[PDB]
Amino acid sequence: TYKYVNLREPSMDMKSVTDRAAQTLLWTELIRGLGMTLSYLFREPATINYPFEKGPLSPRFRGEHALRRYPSGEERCIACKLCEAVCPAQAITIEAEPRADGSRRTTRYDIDMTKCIYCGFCQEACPVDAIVEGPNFEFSTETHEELLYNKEKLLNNGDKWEAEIAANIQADYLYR
């Protein structure tokens, strides 16, 4: 089915013709448009009072990255490199070796946050919930070098944000 957006014939009875003459001379349809903007003047504005108020977000929000731990404090990451393999941007760089206790752990874990596209594939790929995108989006920096995260930065992010990250994962892990 289709419809015509603009295929109508104006009527030619004297009343309709005068109605259009009054429209042309008295600007009635322009006055009508002024009414709409006037109504908006007296509507409450939609503006929120940032930074004292914040736009709403959901548990799935993809923000700044963080490396997580088990409740014992051991790192979850076991250097499988799945996140590195899937990263569409090649933003992840990893090196690994047996730890002094034999554990399979990384010695390098970098995320170039200026390469990253904040797609969340890395956290989908991680089999142990080690790498996540946290809820923080307020981490703009004054220098480029400050956005080249190494393992120490990412672990500090996890320790900094774990309280929120764990609750966000609790809310959404049953959709995953």
Binding site: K54, Y118, E138, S140, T141, T143, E146
Partner: peptide
């Protein structure tokens, strides 16, 4: 460059923070 706003894209609020 004075400020680097991260994200792809940064949210409108993240740009405002920048």
């Amino acid at each position: 460059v004075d400020i680097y706003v991260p994200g792809c894209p940064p949210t409108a609020e993240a740009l405002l923070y920048g």
